[PDB]
Amino acid sequence: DSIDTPNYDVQKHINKLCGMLLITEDANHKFTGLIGMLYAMSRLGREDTIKILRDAGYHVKANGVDVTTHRQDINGKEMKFEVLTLASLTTEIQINIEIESRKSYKKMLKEMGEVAPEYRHDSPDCGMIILCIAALVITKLAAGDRSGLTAVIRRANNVLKNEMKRYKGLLPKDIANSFYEVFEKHPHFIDVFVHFGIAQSSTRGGSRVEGIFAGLFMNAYGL
Ligand SMILES: O=C(O)c1cc(C(=O)O)n(Cc2ccc(Cl)cc2Cl)n1
């Protein structure tokens, strides 16, 4: 009955996984709530994550998260994939996210030639774009609402219009549903998210998305 506790070392990998979903046309966001939450934990670090859970009364069986190279056959030819050792997310699911993302990337090349940095799966702000949706869901959880989904989509289409222009897979309805699902199924993620947001919103300036997140997070307490 383990909880994966990713450390700072797999932060870049989790951001890239977020970015792979963000470039996927009609992406399956079933795992985005979990992946976003894994990104938040990698930003907090393993030590602070275990501290948060233990202090909150949750008894945690910590699973170490490392990057492994998994060799698997796709269309007759053997391919190498970098995956995370996660008890909550199978090797198969991770590899299929990379496969679907690579199909959307080839379609992009065919449409516009080589892709600008801000349109790629490895843009440094992908994890934070996902956590912006989490910040909107947390507000609706706070306000007492349950059928707050309609307002999440509507607020998201306004606040994240530049990012939605950059990413075909930024689908607020599906992503909000995935976070609602993870916060109700795993309430310990609410404590992790709140500690992440308090710590993030301390870091002054930086990136446009980091600023959008800090603003969205600050709102959950009256703004
Ligand atoms: O020249 C590049 O940087 C490059 C090449 C490719 C590709 O061939 O899919 N891609 C996309 C890509 C690479 C790696 C992974 Cl893990 C996922 C995706 Cl979508 N980027």
Side-chain angles (χ1 to χ4, degrees), residues 1-70 72-145 147-203 205-222:
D1 310 357
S2 296
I3 290 95
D4 296 319
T5 58
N7 208 6
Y8 310 106
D9 50 3
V10 300
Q11 207 183 88
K12 200 178 179 286
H13 190 103
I14 305 167
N15 181 73
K16 193 163 296 150
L17 189 59
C18 291
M20 288 188 278
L21 288 156
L22 288 168
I23 71 150
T24 308
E25 295 187 304
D26 190 28
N28 166 45
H29 284 292
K30 191 184 178 286
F31 312 99
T32 302
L34 207 216
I35 292 168
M37 282 319 296
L38 290 168
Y39 182 69
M41 292 188 282
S42 77
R43 284 279 292 255
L44 281 168
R46 182 184 163 108
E47 280 199 314
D48 284 38
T49 303
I50 295 171
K51 187 196 177 168
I52 291 150
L53 300 159
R54 282 180 188 158
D55 278 5
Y58 306 99
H59 191 48
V60 289
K61 182 176 177 282
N63 182 273
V65 184
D66 283 71
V67 186
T68 58
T69 302
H70 181 263
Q72 84 154 42
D73 181 282
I74 292 98
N75 304 21
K77 47 112 92 280
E78 198 201 48
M79 290 278 94
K80 276 93 182 186
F81 294 88
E82 282 242 296
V83 299
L84 302 169
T85 63
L86 287 168
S88 64
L89 203 67
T90 71
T91 295
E92 190 84 274
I93 288 151
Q94 291 180 61
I95 284 174
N96 287 318
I97 288 169
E98 178 174 319
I99 296 170
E100 292 308 319
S101 187
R102 283 180 180 271
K103 286 187 201 174
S104 280
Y105 184 86
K106 192 182 142 176
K107 221 162 178 168
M108 292 174 69
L109 290 175
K110 278 172 86 169
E111 190 184 350
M112 65 211 202
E114 276 295 345
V115 182
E118 68 272 33
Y119 280 73
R120 289 172 55 82
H121 72 287
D122 55 6
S123 170
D125 59 2
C126 299
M128 288 310 290
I129 286 165
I130 294 299
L131 290 184
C132 282
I133 303 292
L136 295 164
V137 176
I138 273 288
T139 299
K140 272 81 187 182
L141 242 79
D145 228 89
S147 52
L149 219 209
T150 29
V152 184
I153 311 154
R154 257 70 185 270
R155 210 161 149 235
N157 290 337
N158 185 77
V159 62
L160 299 170
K161 48 165 84 61
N162 284 87
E163 297 62 33
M164 287 186 324
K165 278 187 274 183
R166 285 168 58 199
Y167 295 115
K168 282 180 188 177
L170 182 43
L171 306 155
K173 183 189 187 161
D174 299 35
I175 304 173
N177 276 341
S178 201
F179 279 106
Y180 267 122
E181 192 79 79
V182 284
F183 294 139
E184 61 192 64
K185 195 189 172 193
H186 308 285
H188 60 263
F189 283 141
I190 301 164
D191 303 63
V192 173
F193 184 75
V194 162
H195 277 81
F196 165 79
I198 265 100
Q200 186 280 341
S201 310
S202 313
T203 86
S207 121
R208 177 197 158 81
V209 171
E210 294 271 354
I212 290 163
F213 176 93
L216 292 174
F217 189 83
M218 272 221 185
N219 277 207
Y221 305 89

